[PDB]
Amino acid sequence: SGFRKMAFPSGKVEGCMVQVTCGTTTLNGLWLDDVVYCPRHVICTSEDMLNPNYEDLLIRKSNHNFLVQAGNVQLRVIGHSMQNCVLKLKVDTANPKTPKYKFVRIQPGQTFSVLACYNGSPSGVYQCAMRPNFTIKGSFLNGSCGSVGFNIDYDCVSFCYMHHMELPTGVHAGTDLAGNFYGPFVDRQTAQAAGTDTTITVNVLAWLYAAVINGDRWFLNRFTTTLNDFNLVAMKYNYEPLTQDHVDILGPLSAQTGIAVLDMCASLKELLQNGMNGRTILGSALLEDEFTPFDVVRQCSGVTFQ
Amino acid sequence: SGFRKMAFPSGKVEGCMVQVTCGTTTLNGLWLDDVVYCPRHVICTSEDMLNPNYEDLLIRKSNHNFLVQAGNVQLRVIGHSMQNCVLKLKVDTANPKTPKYKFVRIQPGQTFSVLACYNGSPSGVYQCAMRPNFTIKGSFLNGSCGSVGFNIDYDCVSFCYMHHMELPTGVHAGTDLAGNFYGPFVDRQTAQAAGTDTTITVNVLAWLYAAVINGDRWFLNRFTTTLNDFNLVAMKYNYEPLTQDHVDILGPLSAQTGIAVLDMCASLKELLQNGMNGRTILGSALLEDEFTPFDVVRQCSGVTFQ
Ligand SMILES: *[C@](O)(C(=O)NCC1CC1)[C@H](C[C@@H]1CCNC1=O)NC(=O)[C@@H]1[C@@H]2[C@H](CN1C(=O)[C@@H](NC(=O)NC(C)(C)C)C(C)(C)C)C2(C)C
Ligand SMILES: *[C@](O)(C(=O)NCC1CC1)[C@H](C[C@@H]1CCNC1=O)NC(=O)[C@@H]1[C@@H]2[C@H](CN1C(=O)[C@@H](NC(=O)NC(C)(C)C)C(C)(C)C)C2(C)C
The missing domain is CATH 1.10.1840.10 (main proteinase (3clpro) structure, domain 3)
Incomplete structure (x- = not known):
C-alpha cells in the first residue's frame, strides 16, 4: 500500500537529451533517430524576444550556427526546419539510445512526467497534469526550455510536452512535440495571462x-x-x-x-x-x-x- | 520558478534492476559489477516467514537454486553470502551498465528517490524521506521487495535503501544496502510497531x-x-x-x-x-x-x- 505522486522511470528519455546552442542561447533538445527537437526561440537574441518573425530569423541561419552537444560529443547539423514552434535539426548521427516512441497531444486533465534538464543534463523528474487552462504547474528555471514531458506505455515513450516559457503567475506553458502550444499562448514576450483554472x-x-x-x-x-x-x-x-x-x-x-x-x-x-x-x-x-x-x-x- | 517533489533521474538505477527467483518467491535484486543484492527473505517459504533462521536456511541452498533474470538474459550464480539482512549473489557476468556508486546509510530526515520495481522492471519513481521513526511512507505492493532508494551526486549513485516490508499502519521498513535495517525492525513476521513519528x-x-x-x-x-x-x-x-x-x-x-x-x-x-x-x-x-x-x-x- 501507500500512494505517492509517482513519475515514470526516466532512463529512456535521459538518453535522448542534448544541449542545443545557437548564438548566446543555450537550451535542451531531444535527440530521436537523427533529429534534434528544441524550442524555436533558440534562434532569438536579447532584443529578438519582443516580436520576432521566426521565419525571417531562421532563413538567416546556417547549419553550422547550431552547436549540438550530446555529452562530450558534438553533433553536426546537416539540415534544419521549423514545424510550428519547434525547430528540427537533422544531424548526421542517429541516437543509438532512441527508444520506441510516439508524439501525442494530450487533453487537459491528463498527467505526465517531466524530466527537468539544464545544458542537456537531467536535473530531476516529477509528475504534472495539463491544467484545464492549458498551463502546467511545473518547476522550471532559466535553462530548462526543451525539457520534455512524457508517459510510457509498456516499452513506448509517448512524448507530449516540451517546455518553452513561464507565465507571470509562476506557471508554465509549452508545446507538444510538433510545436503546437497547449492553450492560447505564443512564444513571444507579449502580454499573456493563463486563464482561470478549474479543478479536475x-x-x-x-x-x-x-x-x-x-x-x-x-x-x-x-x-x-x-x-x-x-x-x-x-x-x-x-x-x-x-x-x-x-x-x-x-x-x-x-x-x-x-x-x-x-x-x-x-x-x-x-x-x-x-x-x-x-x-x-x-x-x-x-x-x-x-x-x-x-x-x-x-x-x-x-x-x-x- | 515552481516547486515540486522532485526525484532524481532514475536511468542509472534502472539499468541495475534484475529479477531474483528462489523457490516460490520472486523479487527484485540490484546488479552492480558481478554481485546481485536482494533481501534475504527470498530464501523463505510460506511457513518460513514466522521465525526463520536464515543461516540454517541459506546453508541448505545451492547456487543453482537462484534464478536471476536480467531482462531476457538469465544470470548464472557462482556464489552466495549473507550480509545482515541482504543476500549477495556472485554472478559470472559484471553488469556493463554499473554506474559509479556508493552504499550509504542515511540519517532520519534525509530524503531519497525510490525506484519502485516489480519482476525486475521499474514501475515508477518518487521522492521519500526517512522518517524520524525510521519508516518511510512509500508506495509498495507485493513484488516490490528489493526496490532501492538512492541519491545521485554529480555522476555517482549513492544507494541508501532497499525495500523489505510493510508495517500494519501502511508504512514501510527496509535496510541499507549492507542489510542493516533502519529502525528496530526485523525481517520476521512478529509483532512490530513503527514507533511514534515526529515532524522534521x-x-x-x-x-x-x-x-x-x-x-x-x-x-x-x-x-x-x-x-x-x-x-x-x-x-x-x-x-x-x-x-x-x-x-x-x-x-x-x-x-x-x-x-x-x-x-x-x-x-x-x-x-x-x-x-x-x-x-x-x-x-x-x-x-x-x-x-x-x-x-x-x-x-x-x-x-x-x-
Ligand atoms: C527558456 O527559454 C530557457 O530555458 N532558456 C534558456 C536560455 C535562456 C538561456 C526559458 C524558461 C523560463 C525561464 C524561467 N522559467 C522558465 O520556464 N523561457 C523563456 O525564457 C521564455 C522565452 C522568452 C521569454 N520567456 C519566458 O519564459 C519569460 N516569460 C514571459 O515573458 N512570459 C510572457 C507570457 C510573454 C509574459 C520570462 C520568464 C523570462 C520573463 C520566450 C517566451 C520567447
Ligand atoms: C516483499 O517480500 C515482496 O515484495 N516480495 C515479493 C514476493 C512475495 C512475492 C514484500 C513487500 C510488502 C508486501 C506489501 N507491501 C510491501 O511492502 N514484503 C513482505 O512480504 C514482507 C516479508 C514477510 C512479510 N512481509 C510483509 O511486509 C508483511 N508485513 C508484516 O508481516 N509486518 C510485520 C511488522 C511483521 C507485522 C505483510 C505486508 C505481507 C503482511 C517478511 C517481513 C519476511
Missing part, C-alpha cells in the same frame, strides 16, 4: 478511490446524488463538469472498491461543502486532482514498463 | 524558505524567537528539536532570502499556533517536511547530474 473533477474522484483502496474511508457517506445535482455543486466550487464519459472511466475503480461512482460524487459534494475539518486524505489536506483514473489503477495494481 | 523541523523550515524563494510570503512576520523558545513550541506540536547545527545548515537559504533562520522559526511558530487559516503554501495545506535544505537549494538553483 474526474481526477479528484480517482484520488478518492485511491484513498479507499488504501484504507482511508472517513469521507464516505450513505448518500447518493445525480450527475446533474453533482455538477450543480461542482460549478459552484470551480470544478470541471463531470461527464457520463468520466463516470464510465471511473468504472473499474468503482468496481474494485464497491462504491458506485455517483456515491463517491456524494462524498465529494460533502467534502466541498464542509471541508475536511482538520482531517487528511492520503497525506493531503487538499483535494488532489493530478492523478488520473489510470494513474490510480497503475499505482494500486503495480503495472511496470520494459 | 529543519525540513519544514527549508520548505518555508523554498516558498519565499518562489513568491509566497504571507506567513512571514516581524517577530523573532530564541532557539530555546522555538523548541518549547516545537515539542508541543510533535516536531523534532531544531539544533544549532540545523540552523547552520539553513544558512545559505537564510542568506539568499534575507530572512534570519530564527525569524523563520518565529513564522513557523505562528503557523503551528494558528494554522494556515484556509491558505496554502507551495500548493500544500499542510506544513511539508520531506524537502531537505539541500533539496531546496538543488531545485531552486538547478543543479544537474552527469
